[PDB]
Amino acid sequence: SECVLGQSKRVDFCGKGYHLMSFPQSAPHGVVFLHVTYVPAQEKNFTTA
Amino acid sequence: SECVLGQSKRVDFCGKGYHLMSFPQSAPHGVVFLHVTYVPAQEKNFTTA
Ligand SMILES: *[C@@H]1O[C@H](CO)[C@@H](O)[C@H](O)[C@H]1NC(C)=O
Ligand SMILES: *[C@@H]1O[C@H](CO)[C@@H](O)[C@H](O)[C@H]1NC(C)=O
Incomplete structure (x- = not known):
């Protein structure tokens, strides 16, 4: 929900670095x-x- | 804490759509x-x- 359907500001939630x-x-x-x-x-x- | 006491940018956490x-x-x-x-x-x- 948060990485695929959106862009998450949560650090190291959707991978290391700034999520795209x-x-x-x-x-x-x-x-x-x-x-x-x-x-x-x-x-x-x-x-x- | 996140939906009631504030506004959530997490997608589909506090409902389907852009949470108000x-x-x-x-x-x-x-x-x-x-x-x-x-x-x-x-x-x-x-x-x-
Ligand atoms: C910046 O300078 C310091 C000391 O001059 C050095 O140790 C450091 O590696 C330098 N950083 C970069 C990114 O060049
Ligand atoms: C935009 O283009 C599509 C092409 O299939 C069309 O179905 C749609 O009615 C157009 N307008 C809207 C409402 O976005």
């Missing part, structure tokens, strides 16, 4: 979610105020 | 929530960019 969308996949006696997430990379130091 | 607010009602050995919800209607196709 999820895709359900069937399995024997279960369900498999492919949690697409946005992971930042290669940060840079900056002076801030 | 909920109202609790007591019942024997349980509780009843009246989930007020905003569901859109009257769609119209439009070209987008």
Whole structure:
């Protein structure tokens, strides 16, 4: 309900990183979610105020 | 806590649609929530960019 039908702000609920969308996949006696997430990379130091 | 005392962004948690607010009602050995919800209607196709 929260990952597939929507976008969840809950941290590490629908996968690590910032959630974008999820895709359900069937399995024997279960369900498999492919949690697409946005992971930042290669940060840079900056002076801030 | 989440539906009555506040507004829930969780999809299909506090009712089917965009949750506005909920109202609790007591019942024997349980509780009843009246989930007020905003569901859109009257769609119209439009070209987008
Ligand atoms: C920022 O600078 C500190 C010390 O100069 C260094 O240890 C750190 O790795 C730098 N971070 C990045 C992302 O370059
Ligand atoms: C939009 O296009 C579809 C094409 O199948 C059509 O059925 C529908 O009536 C159109 N308008 C609405 C109400 O979204």
